[PDB]
Amino acid sequence: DNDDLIDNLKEAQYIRTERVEQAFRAIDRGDYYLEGYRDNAYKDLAWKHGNIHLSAPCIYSEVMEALKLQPGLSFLNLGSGTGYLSTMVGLILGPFGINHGIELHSDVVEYAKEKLESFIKNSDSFDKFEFCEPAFVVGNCLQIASDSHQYDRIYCGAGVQKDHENYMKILLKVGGILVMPIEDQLTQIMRTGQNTWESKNILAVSFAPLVQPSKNDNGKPDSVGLPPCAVRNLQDLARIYIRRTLRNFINDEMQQNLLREKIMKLPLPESLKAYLTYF
């Protein structure tokens, strides 16, 4: 089961740390895998089927390890797929992260939205964290709008072509990290200056090489562009502070949230939304 494989990965030091430990337990494998099988996410095998190419098992263990994911930074996912890893990273980053992903097939995107709604409405770990919900766009991995701001953490969801390597290096903010299976070889890259980069290897992996664009005489190239960064509105902020306060009390007392959130001197729609996020 999930905890079985989580323990095995800690045994192989594929998890190691506590933050990744909590992320992995929070999300159950198979949840994000196709409706017909719901069995093999718990095995290190090929999870390529239809258009889905997820790698929850030790592959994603290694990737999560390579990426630090300290709270408050920004994570950009090229080849998001079913959103499994965007979800996990959101669990860690915290409310004030920037979490964006890009994908080529729209039907899979509809699938990913269905899975997120499933997770919010049915999972048990949601109210144990300040989750960060990922946002999605449709497009190709090589045609991001040309004026993007930058991103601290960049990940390539599939095999990367050498003759576009620098095309991604230009995206990384001064000081960030980039993780990619270039030539199906997993590696880390660090922007140590304005026009200097350094790199290291990780592991020899197996991935399908990406599909390059072929559109011409159109504004597809380097145009897609990630979702706008916006400063949210007061209900979300205030909700977060109130949930902080109550969880802190409950931590002190431990030495159930739903019951507390229901006695608060508030209008019933406010009870449901402003805290409960509609259960």
């Binding site: 209008p267 019933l268 729609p269 406010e270």
Partner: protein
């Protein structure tokens, strides 16, 4: 949770545009949210109370709207009231937000306004306005705005975004169409039987234009509209089609009198009627066909020899009807097709061979050409080619044209060389094959070669002196065109020359085999009588007769003796003696004879002839002592006999050309049914000759019988071509 104490006052102040203090306008924002939060059934009741309030206001509004009895007052009241209501429509959805543009209260307002104030009064609203339009058609210049406003109201009531064409279309346009149809249908009788077709057409066209103007003025032309097409269609149905059967009555009268101006209205109005145009085209076609045929059919047979009148009548008909079609129908393609069909139905009834004859009268030394310059002759030939461009039997021209061209160029009787050369460009314009076009150039080159050969002979042999020797050496087809190769005895000056000519052209010009035709040859010989000397320019037979008479003018020689001397047949000698003794319109006769005759046939073998001792050139009824007399005339041309033989040739072409068409189809159609061959012939035959199928069937049978066309062994209705 009773805030329905200040809210009713402030709502009813908003709606009626009563003064509102800012403080109230601010406070209403706070109270509604207050109630929607601290409650469980505010959301289901705020708008029910709102609906009650709006409905009370609207009931007061109907009371006021109907309080007026005048039509204009009623319309203005509905307009102003809807106006304030719609201005405030955007002013009280701001509060009451998020209780469910797209606002709740706006939908409530528009649905209630229509279900409580429109449907009820509407019965009146769309009636009175329409009456005003009627008054306008009676000369009453009512204020157009009184109707325009109602229009703009309906389109707004349709709160539905997915289908807005509900109120304005349903409850306004139908009234306009019905009123227009009523007015025009009941006003048409004032002229349907009170004036003629022309005045009725003018009235109908003017009314159509006026109602189109009203249509654009008043009917909504927003986009899909389509409003104008329905009003115009109903107007045309009321005014034009209701009288079309009587409008077409005068079409024949107008066409017959060539009243092109009156046909303008006729055509313009009946072009709008889908089934009102065919009668006028049929009238034009049948009028043209009858007007042509009724005279042309008789003229084709009674004319006989007078080609000029036939061609001129054809040209007059063509020009008159072309002018009529150009003017009356504005050069419309349908009427041009009708004109072409009518012209074909007339000119094709059987062969316009006379056209070619006309060209001869324009290209030969005849009175017609002698009074005309070359440019005028070309202009006249333009008429012949114009006529030729229409008749289906086009090749009938070429038979006579080439016969006349050959006789003109070979007999040296052409009016001018340049006018003959212009026939090259004329034939090219007509569209004939170059094989015939270049015949003139080939003939002229042959004539140049003949002149060169004659000069070569003259330079060597110098009987007749070389200076007076003019030997013609032309192509074989130039002269050897008949089997009547009659040869006659020649004077000493020519008998001692011909052997030398033959030797010179046999040896000095190997290959060119000279051949003589004494029938077409002529010459000038000097003779003397008891009254004076003269010169006679006569054919070779007359020359032989007068040479035999030269050494014995005063003797008497019988018909048989003259025959033996000239070695001439019966017919040729008879004609020669008739031209020498009874030359038409000749003051003096060359020869005298004893017996009395009525024609050449009456000459007998024993008839004695003698030289007239008093014959000489006559000028001013006086005997001259010297002068040249030409007595050849028609003797070296041809007689109505040609018209017969040529006619036979025409018949031959009517077969051969048609058969050629068939072949040209089979060379392009390796295997086709009989029907396909006949259909192809319809277009192919138009270039050479288009006979009726009664002869085409027999021609195809002849072609297959002579082993020229193949037939499918298992299908007698399929023709096959090979090689």
């Amino acid at each position: 949770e009773d805030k329905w104490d200040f809210m009713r006052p402030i709502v009813l102040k908003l709606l009626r545009q009563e003064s509102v203090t800012k403080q109230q306008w601010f406070d209403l924002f706070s109270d509604v949210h207050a109630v929607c939060l601290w409650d469980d059934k505010g959301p289901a009741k705020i708008h029910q109370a709102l609906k009650e309030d709006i409905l009370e206001f609207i009931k007061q509004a109907q009371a006021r709207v109907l309080s007026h009895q005048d039509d204009t007052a009623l319309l203005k009241a509905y307009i102003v009231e809807w106006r304030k209501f719609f201005t405030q429509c955007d002013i009280l959805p701001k509060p009451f937000c998020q209780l469910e543009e797209d606002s709740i209260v706006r939908k409530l307002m528009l649905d209630t306004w229509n279900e409580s104030i429109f449907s009820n009064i509407k019965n009146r609203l769309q009636d009175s306005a329409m009456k005003l339009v009627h008054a306008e058609r009676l000369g009453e210049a009512f204020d157009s705005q009184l109707v325009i406003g109602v229009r703009e109201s309906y389109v707004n009531l349709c709160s539905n975004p997915e289908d807005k064409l509900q109120i304005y279309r349903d409850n306004f346009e139908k009234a306009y169409l019905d009123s227009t149809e009523r007015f025009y249908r009941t006003q048409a009788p004032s002229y349907l039987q009170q004036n003629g077709v022309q005045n009725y057409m003018k009235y109908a066209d003017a009314k159509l234009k006026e109602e189109e103007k009203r249509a654009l003025r008043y009917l909504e032309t927003r986009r899909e509209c389509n409003s104008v097409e329905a009003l115009m269609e109903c107007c045309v149905n009321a005014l034009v089609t209701s009288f079309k059967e009587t409008i077409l009555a005068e079409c024949q009268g107008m066409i017959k009198r060539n009243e092109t101006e009156k046909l303008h209205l006729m055509f313009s109005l009946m072009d709008k009627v889908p089934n009102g145009i065919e009668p006028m085209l049929k009238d034009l076609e049948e009028h043209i066909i009858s007007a042509g045929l009724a005279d042309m059919v008789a003229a084709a047979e009674t004319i006989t020899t007078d080609s000029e009148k036939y061609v001129e009548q054809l040209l007059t008909l063509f020009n008159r009807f072309s002018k009529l079609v150009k003017e009356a129908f504005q050069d419309d393609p349908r009427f041009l097709t009708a004109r072409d069909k009518a012209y074909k139905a007339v000119v094709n009834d059987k062969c316009p061979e006379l056209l070619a004859n006309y060209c001869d009268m324009l290209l030969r030394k005849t009175p017609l050409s002698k009074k005309l310059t070359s440019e005028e002759i070309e202009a006249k030939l333009k008429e012949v080619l114009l006529v030729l461009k229409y008749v289906q039997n086009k090749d009938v021209f070429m038979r006579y044209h080439k016969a006349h061209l050959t006789r003109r160029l070979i007999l040296d009787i052409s009016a001018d060389s340049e006018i003959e050369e212009n026939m090259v460009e004329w034939l090219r314009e007509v569209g004939m094959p170059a094989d015939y076009v270049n015949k003139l150039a080939r003939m002229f080159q042959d004539i140049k070669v003949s002149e060169d050969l004659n000069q070569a002979f003259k330079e060597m042999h110098k009987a007749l002196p070389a200076d007076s020797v003019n030997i013609k050496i032309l192509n074989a087809g130039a002269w050897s065109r008949s089997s009547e190769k009659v040869f006659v005895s020649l004077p000493t000056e020519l008998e001692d020359l011909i052997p030398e000519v033959e030797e010179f052209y046999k040896k000095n010009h190997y290959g060119r085999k000279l051949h003589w035709h004494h029938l077409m040859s002529n010459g000038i010989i000097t003779f003397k009588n008891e009254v004076g000397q003269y010169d006679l320019e006569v054919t070779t037979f007359q020359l032989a007769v007068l040479f035999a008479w030269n050494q014995r003018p005063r003797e008497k020689i019988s018909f048989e003796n003259v025959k033996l001397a000239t070695e001439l047949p019966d017919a040729e000698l008879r004609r020669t003696l008739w031209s020498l003794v009874a030359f038409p319109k000749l003051k003096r006769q060359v020869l005298l004879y004893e017996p009395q005759v009525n024609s050449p046939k009456d000459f007998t073998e024993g008839t004695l002839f003698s030289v007239n001792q008093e014959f000489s050139l006559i000028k001013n009824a006086k005997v001259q002592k010297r002068g040249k007399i030409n007595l050849i005339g028609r003797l070296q041309l041809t007689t109505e006999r040609m018209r017969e033989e040529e006619n036979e040739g025409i018949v031959q072409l009517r077969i051969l050309r048609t058969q050629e068409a068939i072949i040209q189809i089979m060379k392009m159609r390796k295997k086709i049914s009989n029907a396909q061959l006949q259909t192809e012939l319809v277009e192919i035959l138009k270039n050479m000759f288009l006979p009726q199928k009664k002869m085409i069937k027999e021609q195809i049978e002849w072609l297959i019988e002579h082993k020229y066309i193949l037939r499918d062994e298992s299908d007698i209705n399929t023709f096959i071509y090979m090689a």
